[PDB]
Write a protein that binds this ligand. Sequence first.
Ligand SMILES: CCCCCCCCCO[C@@H]1O[C@H](CO)[C@@H](O)[C@H](O)[C@H]1O
Ligand SMILES: CCCCCCCCCO[C@@H]1O[C@H](CO)[C@@H](O)[C@H](O)[C@H]1O
Ligand SMILES: *C/C=C(C)/C=C/C=C(C)/C=C/C1=C(C)CCCC1(C)C
Ligand SMILES: *C\C=C(C)/C=C/C=C(C)/C=C/C1=C(C)CCCC1(C)C
Ligand SMILES: *C\C=C(C)/C=C/C=C(C)/C=C/C1=C(C)CCCC1(C)C
Ligand SMILES: [Br-]
Ligand SMILES: [Br-]
Ligand SMILES: [Br-]
Ligand SMILES: [Br-]
Ligand SMILES: [Br-]
Ligand SMILES: [Br-]
Lengths: 261, 258, 259
Amino acid sequence: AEVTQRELFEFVLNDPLLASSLYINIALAGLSILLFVFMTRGLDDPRAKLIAVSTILVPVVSIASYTGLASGLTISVLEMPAGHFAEGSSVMLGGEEVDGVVTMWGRYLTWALSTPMILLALGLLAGSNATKLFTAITFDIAMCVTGLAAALTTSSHLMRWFWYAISCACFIVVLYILLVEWAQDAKAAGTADIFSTLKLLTVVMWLGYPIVWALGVEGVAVLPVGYTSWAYSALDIVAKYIFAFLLLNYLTSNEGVVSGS
Amino acid sequence: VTQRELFEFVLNDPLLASSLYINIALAGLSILLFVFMTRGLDDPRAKLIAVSTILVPVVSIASYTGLASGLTISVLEMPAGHFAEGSSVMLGGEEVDGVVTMWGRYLTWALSTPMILLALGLLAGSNATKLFTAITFDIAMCVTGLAAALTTSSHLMRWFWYAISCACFIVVLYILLVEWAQDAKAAGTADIFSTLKLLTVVMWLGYPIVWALGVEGVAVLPVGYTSWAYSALDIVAKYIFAFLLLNYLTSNEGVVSG
Amino acid sequence: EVTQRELFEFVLNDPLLASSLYINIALAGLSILLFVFMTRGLDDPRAKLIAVSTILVPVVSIASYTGLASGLTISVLEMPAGHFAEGSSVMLGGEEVDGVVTMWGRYLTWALSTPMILLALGLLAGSNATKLFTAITFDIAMCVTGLAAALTTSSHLMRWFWYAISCACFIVVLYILLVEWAQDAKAAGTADIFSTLKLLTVVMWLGYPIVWALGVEGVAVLPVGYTSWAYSALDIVAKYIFAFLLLNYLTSNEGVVSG
Ligand SMILES: CCCCCCCCCO[C@@H]1O[C@H](CO)[C@@H](O)[C@H](O)[C@H]1O
Ligand SMILES: CCCCCCCCCO[C@@H]1O[C@H](CO)[C@@H](O)[C@H](O)[C@H]1O
Ligand SMILES: *C/C=C(C)/C=C/C=C(C)/C=C/C1=C(C)CCCC1(C)C
Ligand SMILES: *C\C=C(C)/C=C/C=C(C)/C=C/C1=C(C)CCCC1(C)C
Ligand SMILES: *C\C=C(C)/C=C/C=C(C)/C=C/C1=C(C)CCCC1(C)C
Ligand SMILES: [Br-]
Ligand SMILES: [Br-]
Ligand SMILES: [Br-]
Ligand SMILES: [Br-]
Ligand SMILES: [Br-]
Ligand SMILES: [Br-]
């Protein structure tokens, strides 16, 4: 590994766009954790608290994920394959010019850890049975891991996009459960309004990621590294922080509705 | 060596490329077929079994792609005394010491078997305790096997990892063939387990036997034959076996429901 | 480009390192035997589930310690400026090498074994699913963020930030085990054994973050050799004896936990 972790860390700092897209989220994730733990202090029902802890875990994983990226621990320099729209790039790391693209794979590694929690909270709010919850979660993880594999794949351009297509198929499974299955389960659960709201927000925001992947450096490359990074951090601010705040706003005011068992 | 160089090593070699790309394609077709076959299930418990099984070829088309792209393939120099020691291969167009190691296979098993196990356990009316015990040791088995494959410091260490792993294997096989076959009687599903009993014992024992005999073990099977031995097993386990389980599940939805 | 073969030889020919690692392999091995023996009497599925979660602990340990012993889970890393271990060197093969022999494999031991002992202590206390889900997730986040700290070499300050995140997660777990579960056990019938262990718990669970901060990963008052025995000493207490005291109570009180 020619490029050191210190060097990548230094490249992030010194790069205004990059460093801000990263450090701003370590900050917002921390404040989110503090606000969430405070908002839910009055919950007592175990099923209501399971929804609150899973929610809270989202920014908890987020602050760790971004610290991994900012430290350089979860960043690597890869060389795109022939034909990849970003093939032939250089990053100027340390003092020399290194071939390749600064790859922030750390985003994928942790999405596989935070998104299931989001899914678990939304399934429970909707009063979902174990089967649909297992189906939503297992495919979500697969969607995130194949995403991480595509980003990590440098041997073949066509391979990169094959991983991507596998990931989309797994994505549609989750989407179908959100829009079709849980939408209906929410009625019987008495949480229709809030679910339909959070459901529409989820579908809209989540669609943003595979769009950014395809337009950013890892895909067709119209967005340079610094910009795809901000595209991902901005989706994160809504998809994770504001979204979790909204779900917890309902829960903390309607404990009785989801209290069941 | 480079990822692309490994990717090209697999393409360009009929034995290797076939042992991998064929698994990618059959896994793809099996996901469709499995989703199709089960389009009619209605019971939640049955459906859990069907999705857990469907995940088998999903994990397979993904993990094999990891291998074919070279992402999960690596080159390792075997320890002194190992029967494959002093091997070399030619990758970046040059003599590279070591053996191409498809460590991605352990990922495939560590992720798909927990799913087939969950499916079988539920089918057998297993309680939580035996389901847990089986899945945990099944995973410890798959991972210690991986450890064995990646160990290059000592020849004896690899075999010690193997012993650790085989131990976890009998724990899993025991509940699979013995415990669950017995629980299935009360669940009204004893027959699917006896019909697939020989198929199950042969394919499962098939993996630790291929290890010992292939490049990772005593090496009477070269890298390419080692790849095809594991691949022919996977084809049986991830596709035909899963199909059989699914074929039964669909005909017995009501009873598996309760 | 140090090899796994050189790391394996480094541990051997290094008395302290070799014994801290090899004594644990041996002790975890017997444990699996002794624990299998002590619990062959069990019949209750709930008592047995608790029994196997606990047996999985020494299994995880003998396997993870073998990873370390084999060199598989060891690496040489260079510490960042200001770090007390920065500027370290180690003899590997036929040349001097910058860095610190990093036993990152230990974090995989804790990440995989602790959720089991937590799933054994929770069920033993009668814990509902919410607490059991909390304690373990934050426990896992703790183990993984600790590794991140150990794996971070770009910034001295970042290591301690990672260590602070890990420590906060650590607080959630200790609050569940010491307080919540302590209460739940009263309605479980198993409040007395939960007490004593809870006491040994505090001391040993705290022992880890204290060692981290004082060993080569922290301010390094303890060299690589001593941090390893420090952790190995703690694992003996938690993975074997603690597991023994737990099983000793279980197998002599299957009626109380039965259900
Ligand atoms: C810029 C300053 C930051 C201000 C943040 C204010 C958010 C506080 C929201 O309060 C919480 O609302 C819940 C109902 O939804 C109540 O149950 C709970 O008791 C109450 O504490
Ligand atoms: C079912 C999904 C599997 C996808 C398999 C993709 C195989 C594509 C092989 O492409 C070729 O690779 C060579 C490298 O060896 C290049 O030199 C050559 O220019 C390129 O055209
Ligand atoms: C906190 C993060 C969130 C909610 C992330 C969501 C991410 C996705 C929905 C990602 C999806 C992708 C695909 C469907 C295709 C391949 C690439 C990915 C991983 C970007
Ligand atoms: C994909 C389907 C199945 C049934 C896979 C089974 C895998 C095993 C039984 C693997 C076993 C191993 C053992 C027992 C010993 C060390 C090496 C292996 C991991 C190959
Ligand atoms: C193997 C058994 C036990 C009980 C292990 C416990 C481990 C911890 C409590 C580890 C804690 C850490 C913290 C809080 C901070 C970062 C570094 C550590 C991972 C060592
Ligand atoms: Br609770
Ligand atoms: Br994340
Ligand atoms: Br269902
Ligand atoms: Br399988
Ligand atoms: Br049992
Ligand atoms: Br433990």
